[PDB]
Design a protein around this nucleic acid. Sequence first.
RNA 1: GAGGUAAAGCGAAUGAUUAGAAGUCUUGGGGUUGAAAUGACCUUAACUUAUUCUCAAACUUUAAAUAUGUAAGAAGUCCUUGUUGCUUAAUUGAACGUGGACAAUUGAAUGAAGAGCUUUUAGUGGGCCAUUUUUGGUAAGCAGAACUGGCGAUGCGGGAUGA
RNA 2: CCUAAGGGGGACUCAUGGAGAACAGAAAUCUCCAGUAGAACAAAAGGGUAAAAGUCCCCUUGAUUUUGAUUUUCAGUGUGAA
RNA 3: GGUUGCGGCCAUAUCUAGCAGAAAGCACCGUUCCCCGUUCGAUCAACCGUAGUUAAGCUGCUAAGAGCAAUACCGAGUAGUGUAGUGGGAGACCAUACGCGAAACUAUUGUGCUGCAAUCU
Lengths: 62, 23, 159, 296, 208, 171
Amino acid sequence: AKSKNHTAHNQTRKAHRNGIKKPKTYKYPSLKGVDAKFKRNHRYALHGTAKALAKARAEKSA
Amino acid sequence: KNTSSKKSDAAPASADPAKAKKK
Amino acid sequence: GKSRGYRSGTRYAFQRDFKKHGAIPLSTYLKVYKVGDIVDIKANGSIQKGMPHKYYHGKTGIVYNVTKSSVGVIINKVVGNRYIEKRVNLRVEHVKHSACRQEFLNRVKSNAAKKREAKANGETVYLKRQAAKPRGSRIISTEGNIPQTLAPVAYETFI
Amino acid sequence: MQKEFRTSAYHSRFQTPFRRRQEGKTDYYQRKRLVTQHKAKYNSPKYRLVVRFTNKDIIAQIVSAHITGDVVFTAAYAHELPRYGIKYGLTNWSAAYAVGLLVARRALQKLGLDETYTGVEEVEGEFELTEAVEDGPRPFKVFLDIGLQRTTTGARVFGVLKGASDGGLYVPHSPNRFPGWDIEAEELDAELLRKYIFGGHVAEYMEELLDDDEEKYKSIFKNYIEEEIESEDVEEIYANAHEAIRADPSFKPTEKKFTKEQYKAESKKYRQQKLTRAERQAKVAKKIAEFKAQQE
Amino acid sequence: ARRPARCYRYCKNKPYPKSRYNRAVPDAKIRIYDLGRKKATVDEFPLCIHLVSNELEQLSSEALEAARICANKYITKVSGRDSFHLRVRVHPFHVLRINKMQGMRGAWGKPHGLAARVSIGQIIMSARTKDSNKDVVIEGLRRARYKFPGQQKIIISKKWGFTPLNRDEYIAKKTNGEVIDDGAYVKFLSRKGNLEANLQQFPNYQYS
Amino acid sequence: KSQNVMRELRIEKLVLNICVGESGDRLTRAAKVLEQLSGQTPVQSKARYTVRTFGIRRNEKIAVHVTVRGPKAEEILERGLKVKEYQLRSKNFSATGNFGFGIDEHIDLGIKYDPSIGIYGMDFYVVMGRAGARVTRRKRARSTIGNSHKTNKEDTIQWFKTRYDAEVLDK
RNA sequence: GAGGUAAAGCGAAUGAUUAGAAGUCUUGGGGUUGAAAUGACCUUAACUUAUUCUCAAACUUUAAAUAUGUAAGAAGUCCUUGUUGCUUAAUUGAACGUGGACAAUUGAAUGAAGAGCUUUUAGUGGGCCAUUUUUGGUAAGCAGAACUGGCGAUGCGGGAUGA
RNA sequence: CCUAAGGGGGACUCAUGGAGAACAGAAAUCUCCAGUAGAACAAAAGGGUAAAAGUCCCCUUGAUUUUGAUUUUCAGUGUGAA
RNA sequence: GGUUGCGGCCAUAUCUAGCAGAAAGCACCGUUCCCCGUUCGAUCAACCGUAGUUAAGCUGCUAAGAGCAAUACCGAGUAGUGUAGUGGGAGACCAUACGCGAAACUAUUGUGCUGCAAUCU
Ligand SMILES: [Mg+2]
Ligand SMILES: [Mg+2]
Ligand SMILES: [Mg+2]
Ligand SMILES: [Mg+2]
Ligand SMILES: [Mg+2]
Ligand SMILES: [Mg+2]
Ligand SMILES: [Mg+2]
Ligand SMILES: [Mg+2]
Ligand SMILES: [Mg+2]
Ligand SMILES: [Mg+2]
Ligand SMILES: [Mg+2]
Ligand SMILES: [Mg+2]
Ligand SMILES: [Mg+2]
Ligand SMILES: [Mg+2]
Ligand SMILES: [Mg+2]
Ligand SMILES: [Mg+2]
Ligand SMILES: [Mg+2]
Ligand SMILES: [Mg+2]
Ligand SMILES: [Mg+2]
Ligand SMILES: [Mg+2]
Ligand SMILES: [Mg+2]
Ligand SMILES: [Mg+2]
Ligand SMILES: [Mg+2]
Ligand SMILES: [Mg+2]
Ligand SMILES: [Mg+2]
Ligand SMILES: [Mg+2]
Ligand SMILES: [Mg+2]
Ligand SMILES: [Mg+2]
Ligand SMILES: [Mg+2]
Ligand SMILES: [Mg+2]
Ligand SMILES: [Mg+2]
Ligand SMILES: [Mg+2]
Ligand SMILES: [Mg+2]
Ligand SMILES: [Mg+2]
Ligand SMILES: [Mg+2]
Ligand SMILES: [Mg+2]
Ligand SMILES: [Mg+2]
Ligand SMILES: [Mg+2]
Ligand SMILES: [Mg+2]
Ligand SMILES: [Mg+2]
Ligand SMILES: [Mg+2]
Ligand SMILES: [Mg+2]
Ligand SMILES: [Mg+2]
Ligand SMILES: [Mg+2]
Ligand SMILES: [Mg+2]
Ligand SMILES: [Mg+2]
Ligand SMILES: [Mg+2]
Ligand SMILES: [Mg+2]
Ligand SMILES: [Mg+2]
Ligand SMILES: [Mg+2]
Ligand SMILES: [Mg+2]
Ligand SMILES: [Mg+2]
Ligand SMILES: [Mg+2]
Ligand SMILES: [Mg+2]
Ligand SMILES: [Mg+2]
Ligand SMILES: [Mg+2]
Ligand SMILES: [Mg+2]
Ligand SMILES: [Mg+2]
Ligand SMILES: [Mg+2]
Ligand SMILES: [Mg+2]
Ligand SMILES: [Mg+2]
């Protein structure tokens, strides 16, 4: 039979109708793949930070 | 006792260049 | 037979620079990378572990993870009509701090210094950069520089 | 007829090694393994115990490496030993032990870890590592850097090792390179190591040589003869030196007979200075004219 | 056997030289590139005449051999075998391919012949001779022009023989002791390097 | 100054080679001869490659050689020069200032003959050098030797003639 | 920041390649001197040295144009000191933070019938042409790739006529 | 294809040329000097490698256990490999 | 300023051939009982600093030096190239327009700078 093998013609036309969109940025990136040892300890540091801020505001309320 | 160690690397030599007859 | 291996077509990309083969200068191992740093990626052919794929050779990205000998860098790669977030683990031999930070971080300092100085002097200063503008009027002195007349030259053969 | 090898293309394509490798002074393989720090410890440095031997001196330095160059923390030289009571044999194995003890104590003085981490105060030659104190700062960790010097059981570099370990520094090591290690029966004869710490081998050489060759004893051990120092009081020389080193390990610089400017002015008088371009052009012109006498 | 040259006139393919990748390549028909009195000194033949290509084109080794023979025959017949030094300035290094010697399947050809790829303004043949032999040498090259496809110009060089200096700069460098013989060519003095070797090589150097 | 104490020529090493063409008992007896002469256990050299014409094969123990230094080297050297009756050739000296000769029977040196051992010829090579060659052989800071301090053919020839009252031919 | 294509280079590496010249104790040979030396001479051929003509998709020091990664702030910069079981010899750092300062020229241009997001489903999955880059082939209204623009799916004015 | 040709450490420096040493010659072994790699690294080719990744020596089993994250091909599925 | 130890950049530092080097340092240098390694205390190990030397290393200077580095009314706005035309030419190819723009060549200049610690006529 024998047919067309490959062509990238018209493929950039299709990608640019609705795409070529830069990804959105967020304030907090996901920590997926971040070192487990750092991630394990970072959990305790954040928990303790919330306690200190909670007590400081609890002082400034009652 | 003791023997000389192979400082060289011509592992698959078993012969040498330049060693041409009639020379 | 088609060939499409991991390092195909990297004959010159992964070559060491001319007269620059051999041991790595140790400032490479003394640099400190922090999460959020912008780094250029350039594969060193003499270190094969933690080596980037040929796509990331010449790309710039953000460090997201720091390990014993490596950093994780986030790259945005075009796949069709959108970007996909890529997370590449690279040994620090293939990584260098991006020089684009130091120009902008200095302009921030210069703008802050200029603003306070104008604030100190009670005047105003404009900090936005401007593109190069067309040049103004000017007067050309001809003392010692009387115009010399040129003409197109005839054709000659020099062989 | 063979090809000349040293062509201009050979020099053009030649890639010179690192400057300090071409000097044959730095093993950059070993330097990379020693210096490089875990990237997740960021700016915490690794500390090296640099130990170098010259023909007359022992140099021990505590160094951390940086991009602008290495930075010395403290340094003890063997030529500091006469201040502590050791005047001769400034390259013994025991002088190495003394230098290691001095640098350990001096570093701990600089840090403030004197009362904590005293070290091995009663040197019996037993293998021991500086253990951390509970509920307190960990001992100053230092890694041994012997440079290009070969690793042999009995080498002098490990004398500085034992001194630094005994001085209170935490220096990770094994005892199978100390003098007195039986390789067949893998245990350390601590008696012979203690012998080596207090110059026992040198004293035994003095005693063994004295009754077998008095003339050689007179030439080799001159300084001992004019000081009337025998073998039996060598140990005290070290035991006192040890005590003095622990009493005041601080660095005292030598009072300089001249100022920096005077030294610089004196040295600047010698050493030829490069010729101006015009001078060498005149030299070239003279050589051309003076070449005219071989025209045949 | 051999196709007409019209099949290989244009540089349609990349250069295909003999290499470790094609080995069964025939030899070029041209093997001799210097003719006449090739051992003559530079001062003997001041006049240089070039045959220059005005085409980006391929010239076969067969054509090079034929044109070389034609020019050599004419000039030695008319002026004598020792009145000139002829040099062919293009070497055929590009291998042409032939397919038939089914259909288009597996059509990669076999080496068939050799051609030199010449550019516009590239010199094909250079002839150094004396001035009095100008009209002979020109007519020798003009006949050789007939053996080539495309357009070629016969250009009288401004330079002395095969040297890169004009016919006036060569005389200046000659009376200044800056030129020495090297057989058929010359060596020029350098103001760089070992001064003693330079002075030894040029004793007659009037230094300024 | 050319007349410096440290510029003194003196022997660096003497190397004794017996290249018996085969392996086994004969090579062992040549090694016995060498260990007898030098008092040190010699070392056997293996063929780098195979040659059928010479009857050798790769890694077959062919030759044996030993290196001697110091007074024993001096004694062996003069013992061998006695056999040569103190007469070498100019061609016996290399461009690097080393020299060598070859004896043909090892009983001429002055050792006891054993029918079991037999007689082996022997090859002598002396490596010359001044003081300070340790620069080129030490591990740290290895460097090269200056031209005046280098050993050459003429200095070695003159030193040999002076120290042994021998003759250096040139046939 | 990355790149190794165009160009360029070969008295620069590698590979190919024309020509002489001067030299050397394995010169490769012929003749002559040799009593014969193998020690000269005439010669050709080898190499070496400084040169010379011409080349490379799977060669290369150098090295574009076009094209390509990142950045140009309020999620920024700086100051102080809280959390941790991580890290440091540490009171060192790491990450996340409290509190404070820097106000519309809040940190290039130009544009923006606004930006962002989701679900679901059709047809299609034979293509072809033009310029330029380009492969096989002698070539082809031939076969095959690169980027773009078109025809297909498109009428209208021009090319008489013609996707 | 490989219990090392895997892993660690240590010592040394290859291809080749020149000048020399009984038999010994173009090729045996020995010595010095030169030697940017012109070698070697299982197998195609490219890259990489010199106080080594090459040669030699010592000790070993990380060619092990639990499973996650990531890169290439990619639909951002699988497999292989890292 | 010299020198040593440890370095950063990694030839403006390398290579060749000469010449010079006060002080200290470094070095060669002396020895083999001891730990240790060798065919060989040559390398490696250890001892003495005692007997000697700047001969060498190292350092500096010299060279129309090789190489390397930098610069440019050098070559050259050349080669190449993005973009354009119902431009030229049978073609091969070429000119023009708006832009970008080499390499070789030529000439000139230079030949390590520098951080921490210690020390010195
Ligand atoms: Mg079909
Ligand atoms: Mg299809
Ligand atoms: Mg091998
Ligand atoms: Mg195939
Ligand atoms: Mg393929
Ligand atoms: Mg590259
Ligand atoms: Mg691997
Ligand atoms: Mg990867
Ligand atoms: Mg303002
Ligand atoms: Mg370098
Ligand atoms: Mg090591
Ligand atoms: Mg084609
Ligand atoms: Mg023909
Ligand atoms: Mg024609
Ligand atoms: Mg035999
Ligand atoms: Mg490519
Ligand atoms: Mg080209
Ligand atoms: Mg090209
Ligand atoms: Mg070029
Ligand atoms: Mg003849
Ligand atoms: Mg605080
Ligand atoms: Mg805040
Ligand atoms: Mg702007
Ligand atoms: Mg959808
Ligand atoms: Mg659908
Ligand atoms: Mg759909
Ligand atoms: Mg459907
Ligand atoms: Mg569908
Ligand atoms: Mg179809
Ligand atoms: Mg269909
Ligand atoms: Mg179109
Ligand atoms: Mg056109
Ligand atoms: Mg087609
Ligand atoms: Mg078809
Ligand atoms: Mg249709
Ligand atoms: Mg339409
Ligand atoms: Mg119409
Ligand atoms: Mg028409
Ligand atoms: Mg129409
Ligand atoms: Mg391996
Ligand atoms: Mg192994
Ligand atoms: Mg190994
Ligand atoms: Mg190793
Ligand atoms: Mg397995
Ligand atoms: Mg697949
Ligand atoms: Mg996947
Ligand atoms: Mg996928
Ligand atoms: Mg998978
Ligand atoms: Mg996969
Ligand atoms: Mg100054
Ligand atoms: Mg002195
Ligand atoms: Mg010794
Ligand atoms: Mg030693
Ligand atoms: Mg000196
Ligand atoms: Mg001197
Ligand atoms: Mg120069
Ligand atoms: Mg110069
Ligand atoms: Mg154009
Ligand atoms: Mg166009
Ligand atoms: Mg028209
Ligand atoms: Mg233009």
